[PDB]
Amino acid sequence: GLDFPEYDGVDRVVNVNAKNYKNVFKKYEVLALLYHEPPEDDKASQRQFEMDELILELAAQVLEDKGVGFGMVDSEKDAAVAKKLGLTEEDSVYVFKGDEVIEYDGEFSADTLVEFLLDVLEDPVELIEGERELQAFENIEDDNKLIGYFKNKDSEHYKAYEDAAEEFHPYIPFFATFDSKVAKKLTLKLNEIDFYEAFMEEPVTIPDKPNSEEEIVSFVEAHKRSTLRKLKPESMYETWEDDLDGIHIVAFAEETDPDGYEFLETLKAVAQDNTDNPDLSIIWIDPDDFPLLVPYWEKTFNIDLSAPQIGVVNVTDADSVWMEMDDEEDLPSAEELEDWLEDVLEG
Amino acid sequence: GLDFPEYDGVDRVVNVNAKNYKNVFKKYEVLALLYHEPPEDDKASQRQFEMDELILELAAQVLEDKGVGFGMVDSEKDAAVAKKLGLTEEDSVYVFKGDEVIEYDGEFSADTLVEFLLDVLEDPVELIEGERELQAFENIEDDNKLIGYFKNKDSEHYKAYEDAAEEFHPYIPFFATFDSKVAKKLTLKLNEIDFYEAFMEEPVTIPDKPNSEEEIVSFVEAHKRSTLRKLKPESMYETWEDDLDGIHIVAFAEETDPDGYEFLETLKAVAQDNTDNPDLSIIWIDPDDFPLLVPYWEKTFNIDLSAPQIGVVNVTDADSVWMEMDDEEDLPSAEELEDWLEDVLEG
Ligand SMILES: [Ca+2]
Ligand SMILES: [Ca+2]
Ligand SMILES: [Ca+2]
Ligand SMILES: [Ca+2]
Ligand SMILES: [Ca+2]
Ligand SMILES: [Ca+2]
Ligand SMILES: [Ca+2]
Ligand SMILES: [Ca+2]
Ligand SMILES: [Ca+2]
Ligand SMILES: [Ca+2]
């Protein structure tokens, strides 16, 4: 009987150098490049470099038929290539698509890279025509999202919207409709764009329509840090490095768990009630999304991640404090959570 | 700022050989051994061997503080060790815990191995004392599960139950209660054991209580192939190799998708209506559980896995046939699915 696919060991990751880098770009619709330092001589450093290269090789096999290419650039041997491509972040992945470059800041794993690059392949704007499509849009909550109403694909204002969408692709989905019925239900005027903050129910309309590309981009940059934001593998390092005053409020909640779900609903209520507070950005971590970090978290924070948790983490030393909750009692209310956070953050 | 944990490149996987294998077993509560053939000389074969060893090294780092050890046994250099440990399946993982051995038959990835070994560490029987625990039990559906009512931990019949639980651990959860209130709600008499087939609402009681270990084990072996079974990474190879007459009925459905959820409910209804048919065992695949195989599946089967699918697959050549469904129409009913399956399987 034929067996499942397996890693075949055939090398597909290109050693990108001065002589071939121009041809590599022409070959691939989407190109992922690991800009890396030369591996040190010690055995441990060699293993680390070995691990990353094989993760890329596995991703390259999976996406070979999709036209996604993978390459490596040595900061020393290929220093000239790095300069003309803008590769500055040491030991980091850069993703190239047409005229856009993405400095990847997420989990370095085959699963997350493949899912991410598959999303990169998609067009930057999703059209809403059917009712299923509209329902799918309305059910998104863990991403910021935008929806605009335009006359048709040839509208000057749609093209500006599409150009702005490319700047945040694929992290922030941009949706569009040309159908006056859909716009009516969304309460969109022609050329109007609504921004739906993650986990918020009410949108914010971009002012001064019709909107240029620059007006859209600047608005999204100002609103992309949501009051409640989910730690996602594709962007985990960016989220964590985006601390306010050197601390994060961190909430663990397993969405599929009855207690985790209830706690998440309370977190959303807290976020909703403080949405315009710029000094607040709670990170929600679903431990099911990070199975390899659960032991580390339980040891480091001395908590049981089979139950909801909320705490404050100092990003310098990983020192933390976590709210006590009794399993035999009902979970804390939104008022109780805000009260506890005020106590901790005062001192 | 302190960064997330990373693979540190330190070797933790033990080269198990005649001289040390006895000490390795004493050191670890749970021991995972890769029984492997000597790597061939070609570059591709070396990469494949390289990949697997580093997957184990990553798992070993994550579970180092949990007391889970990892080792490798060479079928030739360590042939003597393989014999006394019962290592027969070439290039396969064996998991040792106390007096029990598990021939792993699941996905060879760090994520799946770590999750699996964490489950192995847990005790084989889960006691139901609180209401949350009872609700958690009742909400399990994608696993076969057992629940028994016993006087206390010192009951001869509880110990027989616990001994049987070890044989299927951690694939089939065994639950127990000593509380007459819980037993009352479950409709369990003392020493009675109910088996809940995956996705079925009504349990089957093991006959002839009180039950010996052998009676429980034999009953579970006879009932573990459920009418609807989910492809799980931890056991995907066992499920797929357990075909009936050289074909599988395969259903793709994304549980979090509105159409996928509805289709899954229909599959459960089909299974329920044919539960006592031993010639039927539908495999449900949630494509979100296997992101690295979605491109392969879409290419091989010529289907769009963003929509539910049902088909028949020949396990010899991967030849298949898939039911046509119009997105603009309501999904097929249970009667329509059974009708289509009858048509395909007749010819
Ligand atoms: Ca290079
Ligand atoms: Ca996205
Ligand atoms: Ca409006
Ligand atoms: Ca304007
Ligand atoms: Ca806000
Ligand atoms: Ca060995
Ligand atoms: Ca299990
Ligand atoms: Ca009963
Ligand atoms: Ca008996
Ligand atoms: Ca059945």
Residue numbers in the entry:
A (entry chain A), B (entry chain A): 3 to 349
The authors write:
Calsequestrin (Casq) is considered to be the major Ca2+-storage/buffer protein within the sarcoplasmic reticulum (SR) of both cardiac and skeletal muscle, where it resides as either its cardiac (Casq2) or skeletal (Casq1) isoform. Casq binds Ca2+ with a capacity roughly equivalent to a half of its total negative charge and an overall dissociation constant of ~1 mM. When studied in solution, Casq polymerizes as free Ca2+ concentrations increase and depolymerizes as Ca2+ concentrations decrease. We also showed that both glycosylation and phosphorylation alter the physical characteristics of Casq substantially, including its oligomerization and Ca2+-binding capacity.
Calsequestrin crystallized in two forms: the low-Ca2+ forms of native and recombinant bovine Casq1 crystallized in the absence of added Ca2+ in the crystallization buffer; the high-Ca2+ forms crystallized in the presence of 2.5 mM Ca2+ (17× molar excess of Ca2+ added to solution).
